[PDB]
Amino acid sequence: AITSVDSYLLSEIKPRLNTVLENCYIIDEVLKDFDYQTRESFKEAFCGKNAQHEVTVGFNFPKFKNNYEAHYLIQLGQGQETKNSLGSIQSSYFEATGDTLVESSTAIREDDKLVFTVSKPIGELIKVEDIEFAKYDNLQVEGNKVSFKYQTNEDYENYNANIIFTEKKNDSKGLVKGFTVEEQVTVVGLSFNVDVARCLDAVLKMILISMRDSIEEQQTFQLQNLSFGDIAPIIEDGDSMIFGRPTIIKYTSSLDLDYTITQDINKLTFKERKDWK
Amino acid sequence: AITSVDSYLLSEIKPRLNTVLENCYIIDEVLKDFDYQTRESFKEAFCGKNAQHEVTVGFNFPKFKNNYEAHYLIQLGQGQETKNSLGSIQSSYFEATGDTLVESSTAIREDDKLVFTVSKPIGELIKVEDIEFAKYDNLQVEGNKVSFKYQTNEDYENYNANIIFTEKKNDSKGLVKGFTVEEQVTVVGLSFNVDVARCLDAVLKMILISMRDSIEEQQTFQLQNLSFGDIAPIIEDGDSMIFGRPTIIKYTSSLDLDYTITQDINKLTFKERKDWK
Amino acid sequence: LEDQFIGTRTINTSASIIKDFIQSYLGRKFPAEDVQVIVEGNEARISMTVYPIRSF
Amino acid sequence: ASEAKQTVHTGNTVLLMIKGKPVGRAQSASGQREYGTTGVYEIGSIMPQEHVYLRYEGTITVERLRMKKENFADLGYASLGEEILKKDIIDILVVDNLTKQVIISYHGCSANNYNETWQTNEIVTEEIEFSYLTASDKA
Amino acid sequence: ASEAKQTVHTGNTVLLMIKGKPVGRAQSASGQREYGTTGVYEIGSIMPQEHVYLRYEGTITVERLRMKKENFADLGYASLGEEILKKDIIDILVVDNLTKQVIISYHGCSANNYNETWQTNEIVTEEIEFSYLTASDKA
Amino acid sequence: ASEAKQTVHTGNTVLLMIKGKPVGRAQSASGQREYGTTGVYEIGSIMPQEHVYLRYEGTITVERLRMKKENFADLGYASLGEEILKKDIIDILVVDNLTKQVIISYHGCSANNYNETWQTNEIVTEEIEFSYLTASDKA
Amino acid sequence: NFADLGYASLGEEILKKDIIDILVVDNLTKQVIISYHGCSANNYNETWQTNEIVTEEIEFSYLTASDKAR
Amino acid sequence: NFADLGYASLGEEILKKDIIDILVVDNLTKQVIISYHGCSANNYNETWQTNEIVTEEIEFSYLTASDKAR
Amino acid sequence: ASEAKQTVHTGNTVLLMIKGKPVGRAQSASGQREYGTTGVYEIGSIMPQEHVYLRYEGTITVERLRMKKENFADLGYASLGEEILKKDIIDILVVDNLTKQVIISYHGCSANNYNETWQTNEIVTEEIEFSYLTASDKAR
Amino acid sequence: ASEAKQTVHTGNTVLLMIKGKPVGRAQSASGQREYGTTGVYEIGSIMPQEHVYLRYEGTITVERLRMKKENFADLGYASLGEEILKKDIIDILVVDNLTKQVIISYHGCSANNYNETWQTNEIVTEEIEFSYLTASDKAR
């Protein structure tokens, strides 16, 4: 697909940041190496459900004033294409496949089959969690349902699973044409308190490590690489300075389009014609 | 873990600096190559218990005035990730282990065992100083105690040892996920006297050499590498100039998280099911 | 037949790794198509298909 | 956005597992494989008439940073001395990190050589090479 | 402006096709060919009198990024184990991307070796080499 | 913060000791080891049936800056001339710097070759290679 | 094979063979280059190897040779 | 081994052996390719080496050979 | 494979022993055996009607690096001169290195020839050949 | 291992001596010995009933680089013509280089053949073969 690393990072960082900040012992583990008073002050101010201060995330160049006490500024950077395929053919498909998804589901009995229902039509099934079927189990997929023979499996009549699968758009042939790009995004934790900037740096590094395992950047946005700048005053001529430490996140990812092929051939036919010269 | 090289350096330098400055013959050895008058003036001013002047250490950008006669300014610098593991698996553990520790302890008799008591639960024992046990000695560890058979060892009933060990957090499985970072910190000895700046440089180099053997940067913060700047006026438009010579300390270290695994499997079970076709 | 492992000797195991391990055991020692693995909680039920003799 | 229709494996996507433990700090794995394909020639033409497979061979080579604990020597997979004579064959699995699903299995690995390099500005490196009896994948 | 009177093929201009499917993410193809040309010498001069062709040989080598699906192993063209004995010869076509017109055909390919490299800062790489019976082009 | 659960050895972490003296200014040590693993083949299949260990071999190579005193020649471990015939085997220990605990022992070392390079913009370098009878670690 | 085509013998059947002519022939024109006339087998040999193609070798004594076919 | 399987002899026991048939067989179909009939041992040989696999070699004279089993 | 699990014997899996002591520095041993097998022919067929055994013969050859002590000459298993007349026949065993179970005995070995070679820059070598009476899967 | 501690003899650990002087430039020596060992057979068994020694024979071969002086011809240990008739038998010793203890004596050596080779770009070589009467662990 076409991709937007900045919007991915914003969408991914915001919930993760919230879920760490609402959970005190996580911060208590992340900041174990800092000075005791720095740790306790940060945990008192920003952390837990009762926290009176709050962190914020957003892109650069807003028209309004931000929460300069603690704010992650996201800032789309450079990139370059790095590796190309022969013919620019990144892949080919017989059935137009969408995004990868993971969904929780439960088995149910139906007509002496077990079935799992999924919210969308299954274009491909990658894994039913914790199950490997035998041929006897007569595994079949149909529409948005996975179906599974009941006879030997009655104990599992309410078994709970996670389905990893991917959508289908439509039944069509084509070529995925495109290339790989290596692209940079900068993130900086602004604070007018230097110890807050240092803690926001630690929290961001933890978040990015945790992010490396996510499906989003396992399937796309691969090879996350981190670089770190000096701590410096971002703005120097207010009633106080504003500090931050930049980090650069670099990703390798595919830019591509679905070139559908309308041509289809369904029968050869043969004829002999005679040359009398 | 997540780590903070700047706070490590501050915590490590301050006590070492104090303990050198309170000990005259150490300075007399460190400064043996300097001019006699420089050496004696420094030793008179800053050194020994009666020293009327004092050195100081702290981070950059304080809001107050510092002791510009002699002050080590610590200044967090750049870094970059350098080496990655396959799957980002830095290690794996069956029991969540804390920091490494070294503690002095003495043996005591208890129920015809010798035991050493340690301040914290022993997650792993690395070394009992100056002892290698035989199988006959029936070495066992339990909770926060090390225990050791009395029968043949009665002469050692009050033996004094150092225990090198590491804490345990909890009994859980997981993967240590993370990567290695190479990171820089700058340190500069500010003085309005140039000969004091040169002596503070010498003392700092001695301190860093001594630091290379510490457990902190043996286990983490490995491969200390030093670079040195020119001596120059840091500030030039007071009633006097302030001089300093920067040094850059570069460290290689691991950034990682404990990804605990809740899944555990404790019995396989087998069944045969018959296919009548 | 039985082969069994217990006692925390492993990390991060999955139903696929169990099935391959069984085939490593069997291959060094019946078809991989003919065996099923279900993992649930702490239990891995391994089920082998077998062919009883029908009369013509 | 995450798409399956194109995806490549990467150093972060793949676990290496031995005896059900992941190998920490593995730096590379290189699998090589050869069939001895020999061409058939005869009087009457310069062209090859046929190709035949005659001898399967393969090796797996692993480079790793030497940890202070759980080395290949401490794990027992490597051998420093005569105790090589007492090591049974082991199976090395390369596994998808997301799905925990086996990508390729190397069966019957047996050590050819083992190296350690101690150097003054670097982390210490283990390297080991195994001959193996066969490789397979299952899906 | 687009001129035919001069034009060169480029990585973007050329499809690689096997069994009527394009090979995605192929990084290179290298075709090599040898005729065994032997010079004839005799008593009476140092000069070669003649050259003769005695033995045709050639190989096609392909490097590819290891996809998560439709690998050479998943496509079945490569072989990891004894099942190499059950793979029939395949024909590899290099085809003009614009005209869909065959540039060169390698006929009767048969695998010599197969490699995979797993490395920590890189995409995983497949590489495969085939001996082939002949090559041809048609126009 | 200092953690044991992950740690790697580094040039600063490891002492090299010979006869209970540390070797100053050692620049590298390289240990190599080989078992002669030979594959067994037979009529009836192309697959290897088994692997056997047949011949152990190993070497330790050390590079060092040539000191003005306590060279390998001055220490007597190296030999320049016929006095090589009068040097008994020596054991080389690689030891943890923190714990003073033996990481690996090379037993029965015997010198293969000895080099010195004198060059105009560099410190002089010794290099020496030993064959050894066995290696071991103890824990 | 020679055994399958009946040009070689393994046992008593050698007594029921008869002499044969072997031709070496121009590959382009199929003109004969050499005929060996009245070939009769002296010995026949086979070798089996772990990782090689199986080989046959046969030796015939012959009566005469000519630039032409019989 | 041949000694363990009773197909070879080390001493007097050679006198109590009797002739055997050796088959070379198609690995796919298990169809016989060649039978050697009535094999009887001529010599038997062993070699031991410092760093190699031990080898056996045996030679039989035989009465007849055939495209088929007896 | 473990030495306990190899299907084939190898040089490290076996020992050579004489009079209950292991023969050190043994480089190789070669054992040969012939039965004099002769085919019988008669008028009316070109083919051998049967084969018959006539004369058993066998030789065992041993090659070693010459030690400074405990050579064959020093151990009294070889002869240089008249002393050959005062030797008597010996049994040579090849033995499983793990279990010390006998693999082969050669019975009644008697020396045929004895050979030495000296070289500028090589280890000195000994080679000895014995004819023997019989061989067995077991000790005498 | 130290030369004092090697278990095997090597070319540097031994000397070759004739008439109490060391033979310089010696490249190789080969000593061979045969006893004529013959097996006895009789009607009623296919197997040798015993082996007996019949005829001792032995030869010592020595090969050297030809020196400009003190060749075998110059030292009088070899012959080119009639002078062979006026030679007499000599003893050749192989001796421990450290202790000068004798390792082997060959007694009563008499020359069989003598050989020389000249080459464009190589060191000249001598080879000589003696038959000898007996050998011993000790000097005469």
Cα distance between residue A87 and residue A265, in whole Å: 22
Contacts of I10 in chain H (CB under 8 A): 52-54
> Is I125 part of the contact surface with chain J (CB cutoff 8 Å)?
no
Contacts of B89 in chain D (CB under 8 A): 15, 22-26
Nearest CB partner across the interface for H51, out of F40, F44, F54: F54
Cα distance between residue F23 and residue F90, in whole Å: 14
Contact indicator for J65, J125 with CB cutoff of 8 Å: yes
Residue numbers after which chain F breaks, C to N beyond 2.5 angstroms: none
DSSP F98: T
What is the least distance, in Å, from the CA of A139 to any CA of chain B?
A: 16
Cα distance between residue A233 and residue A265, in whole Å: 66
Contact indicator for B254, B220 with CB cutoff of 8 Å: yes
Contact indicator for J94, J29 with CB cutoff of 8 Å: yes
Cβ neighbours around B236 below 10 Å, total: 10
B: neighbours with 3+ CB pairs under 8 Å?
A: A, C, D, E, F
CA-closest candidate to residue A93, choices A3, A166, A2, A181: A166
Q: In what order do the strands lie in the sheet with A131-132?
A: A131-132, C35-40, C43-50, B267-274
CA-closest candidate to residue C16, choices D5, D116, A129, F139: A129
Over chain B, what HEC string results? Answer: CCCCHHHHHHHHHHHHHHHHHCCHHHHHHHCCCCCHHHHHHHHHHHCCCCCCCCCEEEECCCCCCCCCCCEEEEEEEEEEEEECCHHHEEEEECCEEEEEEEEEEEEEEECCEEEEECCCCEEEEEEECCCCCCHHHCCEEECCEEEEECCCCHHHCCCEEEEEEEEEEECCEEEEEEEEEEEEEEEEEEECCHHHHHHHHHHHHHHHHHHCCCHHHHHCCEEEEEEECCCEEEECCCCCCEEECEEEEEEEEEEEEEEEECCCCCEEEEEEEECCC
Tell me which chain B residue has its CA closest to the CA of residue A212.
B88
What is the least distance, in Å, from the CA of D60 to any CA of chain B?
A: 16
Contacts of A135 in chain C (CB under 8 A): 33-34
Over chain A, what HEC string results? Answer: CCCCHHHHHHHHHHHHHHHHHCCHHHHHHHCCCCCHHHHHHHHHHHCCCCCCCCCEEEECCCCCCCCCCCEEEEEEEEEEEEECCHHHEEEEECCEEEEEEEEEEEEEEECCEEEEECCCCEEEEEEECCEECCHHHCCEEECCEEEEECCCCHHHCCCEEEEEEEEEEECCEEEEEEEEEEEEEEEEEEECCHHHHHHHHHHHHHHHHHHCCCHHHHHCCEEEEEEECCCEEEECCCCCCEEECEEEEEEEEEEEEEEEECCCCCCCCCCCCCCCC
> Is F47 part of the contact surface with chain H (CB cutoff 8 Å)?
no
Is there contact between A and D if contact means ≥3 C-beta pairs under 8 Å? yes
- What length is written for chain A? 277
What is the least distance, in Å, from the CA of F56 to any CA of chain H?
A: 10
Contact indicator for F125, F52 with CB cutoff of 8 Å: no
Backbone angles phi, psi at H3, to 5 degrees: -65, -40
Angle, CA F109 vertex, CA I3 and CA I27 arms, to 5°: 45
Cα distance between residue I12 and residue I6, in whole Å: 11
Tell me which chain D residue has its CA closest to the CA of residue F16.
D118
Give the tokens for residue F110: 């015997």
> Is E83 part of the contact surface with chain F (CB cutoff 8 Å)?
no
Cα distance between residue I5 and residue B8, in whole Å: 54
Contact indicator for D8, E125 with CB cutoff of 8 Å: no
Contacts of J47 in chain H (CB under 8 A): 11-12
The answer for A184, left when phi > 0, alpha when psi is -120 to 50, beta otherwise, is beta
CA-closest candidate to residue I92, choices I4, I6, I22, I27: I22
Amino acid symbol at J96: D
Give the number of C-alpha atoms closer than 13 A to the C-alpha of residue A259, restricted to the C-beta side. Answer: 13
Mutate to test the interface with D, among A218, A256, A258, A260 (most CBs of D within 10 A): A218
> Is B274 part of the contact surface with chain A (CB cutoff 8 Å)?
no
Tell me which chain E residue has its CA closest to the CA of residue F46.
E82
F46 to D69: CB separation less than 8 angstroms, yes or no: no
B242-244 and E90-96 as β-strands: parallel, antiparallel, unpaired? Answer: unpaired
Contact indicator for D46, C37 with CB cutoff of 8 Å: no
Quoted resolution (Å): 3.6
H: neighbours with 3+ CB pairs under 8 Å?
A: F, G, I, J
Contacts of F40 in chain I (CB under 8 A): 7-8
> Is J7 part of the contact surface with chain F (CB cutoff 8 Å)?
no
Tell me which chain B residue has its CA closest to the CA of residue E119.
B86
Give the tokens for residue C16: 């696929």
Residues 15-34 of I with CB under 8 A from F: none
> Is E82 part of the contact surface with chain F (CB cutoff 8 Å)?
yes
Residue I11's SS3 state is helix
Way the structure was solved: cryo-EM
Nearest CB partner across the interface for A152, out of C14, C37, C47: C47
Instruction: Give me the residues paired with residue I40 across strands.
Output: I50
Cα distance between residue A109 and residue I135, in whole Å: 75
Contact indicator for B165, B125 with CB cutoff of 8 Å: yes
> Is B58 part of the contact surface with chain A (CB cutoff 8 Å)?
no
D29 to E118: CB separation less than 8 angstroms, yes or no: yes
Cβ neighbours around C26 below 10 Å, total: 14
Cα distance between residue B199 and residue B26, in whole Å: 13
F52 to I11: CB separation less than 8 angstroms, yes or no: no
Nearest CB partner across the interface for A134, out of C14, C36, C39: C36
Instruction: Give me the residues paired with residue F115 across strands.
Output: F127
What is the least distance, in Å, from the CA of D7 to any CA of chain F?
A: 31
Give the tokens for residue B40: 């004696």
What is the least distance, in Å, from the CA of F5 to any CA of chain H?
A: 42
Residue B86's SS3 state is helix
Give the tokens for residue J29: 């020596």
Q: Which residue has the tokens 């009050």?
A: B158
Nearest CB partner across the interface for G3, out of H24, H64, H67: H67
The answer for F103, left when phi > 0, alpha when psi is -120 to 50, beta otherwise, is alpha
DSSP J77: S
Cα distance between residue H65 and residue H32, in whole Å: 12
Give the tokens for residue H36: 């050697």
Cα distance between residue A209 and residue A213, in whole Å: 8
CA-closest candidate to residue G43, choices G19, G55, G60: G60
Please return the burial class of B239, using the count of CB atoms within 10 Å of its CB with bins 0-12, 13-18 and 19+. Answer: exposed
Contact indicator for J127, J115 with CB cutoff of 8 Å: yes
Angle, CA J95 vertex, CA J93 and CA J97 arms, to 5°: 150
What is the least distance, in Å, from the CA of F20 to any CA of chain I?
A: 33
Instruction: Give me the residues paired with residue J113 across strands.
Output: J129
DSSP E41: E
Cα distance between residue B160 and residue B137, in whole Å: 18
Contact indicator for J90, J19 with CB cutoff of 8 Å: yes
Over chain F, what HEC string results? Answer: CCECCCCECECCCEEEEECCEECCCEEEEEEEEECCCEEEEECCEEEEEEEECCCCEEEEEEEEECCCCCCHHHHCCCCCCHHHHHCCCEEEEEEECCCCCEEEEEEEEEEEEEEEECCCCCCCEEEEEEECCEEECCC
Please return the burial class of B255, using the count of CB atoms within 10 Å of its CB with bins 0-12, 13-18 and 19+. Answer: buried
Is there contact between D and G if contact means ≥3 C-beta pairs under 8 Å? yes
Cα distance between residue H12 and residue I135, in whole Å: 9
> Is F40 part of the contact surface with chain G (CB cutoff 8 Å)?
no
DSSP states of C3-52: ----SS--SS--HHHHHHHHHHHHHH---GGGEEEEEETTEEEEEEEE--
CA-closest candidate to residue B99, choices B190, B166, B181, B16: B166
Contact indicator for D60, D129 with CB cutoff of 8 Å: yes
Give the tokens for residue A72: 């992650």
- What length is written for chain D? 139
I47 to G15: CB separation less than 8 angstroms, yes or no: no
Q: Which residue has the tokens 């067995």?
A: I136
What is the least distance, in Å, from the CA of J130 to any CA of chain H?
A: 33
DSSP states of D99-122: T--EEEEEEEEEEEEEEEEEETTS
> Is E70 part of the contact surface with chain A (CB cutoff 8 Å)?
yes
Cα distance between residue D103 and residue D86, in whole Å: 29
Q: Which residue has the tokens 């010592």?
A: J60
Contacts 24+ apart (CB under 8 A), F40-46: F40/H53, F40/I7, F40/I8, F41/D55, F41/G50, F41/G51, F42/G50, F43/G48, F43/G49, F43/G50, F44/H27, F45/E82, F46/D35, F46/D36, F46/D53, F46/D54, F46/D55, F46/D56, F46/E82, F46/E85, F46/G51
The per-type count for chain G, helices as H runs and strands as E runs, is 1, 4
Give the number of C-alpha atoms closer than 13 A to the C-alpha of residue F15, restricted to the C-beta side. Answer: 17
Backbone angles phi, psi at A231, to 5 degrees: -80, 130
CA B171 to chain CA centroid, nearest Å: 26
Contact indicator for B174, B260 with CB cutoff of 8 Å: yes
Cβ neighbours around B107 below 10 Å, total: 22
Cβ neighbours around B90 below 10 Å, total: 26
Mutate to test the interface with A, among B2, B61, B181 (most CBs of A within 10 A): B2
What is the least distance, in Å, from the CA of D120 to any CA of chain B?
A: 9
Give the tokens for residue B247: 């040094």
Backbone angles phi, psi at D46, to 5 degrees: -80, -10
End-to-end CA distance of chain A: 57
For residue A63, what are the CA distances in angstroms to A10, A58, A239, D87, E116?
A: 18, 12, 21, 69, 52
> Is E85 part of the contact surface with chain F (CB cutoff 8 Å)?
yes
Nearest CB partner across the interface for E115, out of D16, D31, D47: D31
Tell me which chain G residue has its CA closest to the CA of residue D36.
G51
Please return the burial class of I109, using the count of CB atoms within 10 Å of its CB with bins 0-12, 13-18 and 19+. Answer: buried
CA-closest candidate to residue F94, choices D71, B135, B84: D71
